[PDB]
Amino acid sequence: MKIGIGSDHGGYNLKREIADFLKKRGYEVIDFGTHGNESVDYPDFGLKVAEAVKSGECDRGIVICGTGLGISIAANKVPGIRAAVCTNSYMARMSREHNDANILALGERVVGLDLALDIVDTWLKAEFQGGRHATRVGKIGEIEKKYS
């Protein structure tokens, strides 16, 4: 399974830690940058990860900024993307079980490293439950079709 990862300078150090964690577990990782601490704009990297997920070049993505908010809002602008900002494993599990999220968003200034690794572990392992959740995901798709 291939994981795209991306961040602004606010999520860069946590991104390096997560890239390292994911490889150790045998995931293939595509790092879309950013590639240092220089100030950059979270929507550009949100977009790269979200577009790699939409095109099937990654199966899912993880996006990181100070809070997770900006980069996840930007990712969710892409039709077919469901980016979930999670600050605990319960939200991470539900985002997979219920929302079928294909992007996990994290905030490097909000969650400490080991908590964020717990969240990523939970999210990678949880599974979509279909049923009424698929119905609701289709209704998300109807919003996208409306404003397309």
Ligand X SMILES: O=C[C@H](O)[C@H](O)[C@H](O)[C@H](O)CO
- Among 13, 27, 4, 119, which Cα is nearest to 65's? 13
19 vs 116, beta carbon nearer a second copy: 116
Among ligand X, a second copy, none, partner that 148 touches (CB below 5 to 8 angstroms by kind): a second copy
Residue with tokens 């939200």: 91
Contact string (CB under 8 A) for a second copy, positions 52-91, x = contact: --------------xx-xx--xx-xxxx--xxxxxxx-xx
Q: Does 116 sit near a second copy (CB under 8 A)?
A: no
- 99 is an annotated ligand-binding site residue: yes
Binding-site residue ranges: 8-9, 66-70, 99, 109, 132, 136
